[PDB]
Amino acid sequence: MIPRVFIYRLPQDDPRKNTAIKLVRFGFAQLVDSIKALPSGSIILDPTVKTPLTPSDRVIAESRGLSLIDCSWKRAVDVHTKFIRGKFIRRRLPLLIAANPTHYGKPYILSTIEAVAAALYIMGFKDEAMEVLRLYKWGPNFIIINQKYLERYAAGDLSPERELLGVDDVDNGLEQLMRVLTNG
């Protein structure tokens, strides 16, 4: 049974190409009208923090829910750093490769729907993750190209990250991947 997913969306991009709108349209998640309306004590996905999501976070997702902010990647750092404090259990995703047509093959920077599916998979909701990904023709391939990493991540093993990113200093590497989008 899929955990309850809640999304606050910054209405910036055109919604016909936004993956969060599609999640909501099919009932995998529900939109809320503000960040304050997101459930307190829930897991919130947050690419700006250094603490990776682990399988044991499942217990929180089941009981409080899973929250996300949908915005442009150009605004993502500013939004997450300035508007969510204390209210949530903030977790980045472990390092994964994007499968969407825009950023295919590139690390860490995922679409909202890929992030939701990754979170679900890691927390043991593999069937739900696939149901979500099947909303796009390229969706299931996200698990395929990340299969070896996801298997370790779902088993609580984060050792793939340094080899995949190719740096010991993962923190700096992640900060730079996002800096590229912030400044471009």
Ligand X SMILES: C[Se@@+](CC[C@H](N)C(=O)O)C[C@H]1O[C@@H](n2cnc3c(N)ncnc32)[C@H](O)[C@@H]1O
112 is in an annotated binding site: yes
> Which secondary structure element, helix H or strand E, spans residue 82, and what is its range?
helix 73-83
Measured CA to CA, the distance from residue 156 to residue 177 in angstroms comes to 24
At position 35, the amino acid (one-letter code) is: I
From the CB of 1, what's the least distance to ligand X, in Å? 22
Residues that bind ligand X (CB under 6 A): 13, 18-20, 45-47, 68-71, 73, 76, 92-93, 108, 110-113, 115
By beta-carbon proximity to ligand X, the closer residue of 12 and 159 is: 12
19 is in an annotated binding site: yes
3-state secondary structure of 43: strand
From the CB of 51, what's the least distance to ligand X, in Å? 10
From the CB of 86, what's the least distance to ligand X, in Å? 18
145 is in an annotated binding site: no
Exposure letters 1-35 (e unless 16+ CB within 10 A, then b): ebbbbbbbbeeeeeeeebbbbbbbeeebbeeeeeb
54 is in an annotated binding site: no
Dihedral sign computed on CA atoms, order 89, 25, 105, 127: positive
From the CB of 59, what's the least distance to ligand X, in Å? 19
Going by the annotation, the residues of the binding site for S-adenosyl-L-methionine are 19, 69, 93, 108, 112
